[PDB]
Ligand SMILES: Nc1ncnc2c1ncn2[C@@H]1O[C@H](CSCC[C@H](N)C(=O)O)[C@@H](O)[C@H]1O
């Protein structure tokens with residue numbers, strides 16, 4: 001439906017201004033054959049505000065892409081704050097690095113290249129946590145296991161956000177053949193069973209396909 | 220539409236459990252001849268999570284109705300925490316008081332029966348602030364002025380949430396003659412012009428009509 005796109009433009013015209021660095025991060029996707037699946041401008045503003053509510057000094061992100069979400073959240077940090085972002089595809093990591101450098105965030109953002117499931121245990125061994133806010137936005141089948149590692153890297157009060165857990169309502173389909181839909185359903189079931197967090201799922205509409213984000217606070 | 224309602228039920232089954240006090244607050248509406256306009260269960264859980272992220276000890280609410288939103292937020296408070304809620308309709312205030320008593324929240328929730336525009340300057344005279352979180356959800360035309368009073372009762376980092384600021388996308392109609400739509404448009408314009416806060420509007424779908432909430436953090 002057109003109405004959600006029109007209302008998103010109305011909102012971003014008021015409260016979703018994008019500077020050159022964010023517009024250049026979006027423009028970088030097509031040039032590198034990367035999917036146009038960044039958070040929307042209004043979702044970026046929302047993640048920035050959540051980071052401010054957390055008084056975030058240390059943020060962990062799974063799934064960098066071009067660093068669009070990364071720039072929004074890193075801009076909530078104090079100058080001595082750090083965002084670690086994990087990216088499997090070396091092409092995406094190099095594009096994201098250029099975009100972070102253009103944004104003047106080189107000293108605040110560490111891009112680690114590799115599988116999230118390989119790097120998360122390294123972060124625990126290094127004592128990189130606890131993170132004030134964790135954004136889970138990589139491949140979807142392992143969301144459930146990514147959340148278990150996120151808890152190992154959390155403090156009481158840590159906010160864990162997981163993107164793309166509604167998928168146009170396809171999570172209602174118990175017989176879905178789509179691995180990302182199966183991954184979201186398994187993650188959502190895990191969150192429903194979890195005693196370590198208070199959580200909800202926010203349905204989200206706008207310029208992107210109908211979807212949702214899970215928000216979880218570590219008790 | 221049906222999909223948004225079905226997905227809302229899926230989410231509330233996982234993460235939106237309502238105890239007897241919440242269900243009794245909902246049931247009180249039809250018995251009392253009150254409009255069925257409480258926040259949804261999943262919106263209630265979201266407000267509770269935001270109050271936890273604020274580490275709220277002092278909460279202000281405009282517009283109590285039967286106290287449904289009030290119960291969700293007051294349950295985030297520590298035992299020495301307080302929520303002040305403003306309700307113009309003495310019948311609504313009496314119904315909310317019974318519902319708050321049933322929830323065991325009598326000691327922590329103060330219902331003030333009168334117009335918010337009359338009571339807000341009383342709270343300033345009393346030094347009742349600052350509030351960690353403010354929920355604006357009363358009559359719609361004066362939302363703009365309620366927000367100015369909310370800033371007078373805020374600290375740096377206060378979260379201000381305003382419900383019902385999208386109204387099924389009717390805020391796109393500059394020629395709307397509906398008081399609630401004009402109130403939302405004027406508030407949204409104020410919010411886009413306001414240099415005292417960082418803010419967004421979240422589009423919302425689910426069991427209620429397509430709408431949205433404004434979220435603002437005081438600088
Ligand atoms: N196993 C894995 N570990 C880490 N990153 C992975 C991964 N599998 C996929 N990814 C990456 O996850 C990303 C998902 S898109 C991330 C979008 C970004 N958070 C934004 O909103 O701007 C892609 O860059 C993809 O390459």
Ligand SMILES: Nc1ncnc2c1ncn2[C@@H]1O[C@H](CSCC[C@H](N)C(=O)O)[C@@H](O)[C@H]1O
Pocket residue numbers: 256257258281282283284285286287288289305306307308311333334335336356357358
């Ligand atoms: N001037 C005013 N001052 C305070 N409350 C007002 C008001 N005008 C209307 N109201 C009240 O605002 C309420 C709007 S409905 C509030 C719903 C409630 N927050 C919930 O989600 O559960 C009604 O109870 C109405 O009586």
Ligand SMILES: [Mg+2]
Pocket residue numbers: 037038039137163164
């Ligand atoms: Mg995503």
Ligand SMILES: [Mg+2]
Pocket residue numbers: 256257258356382383
């Ligand atoms: Mg309302």
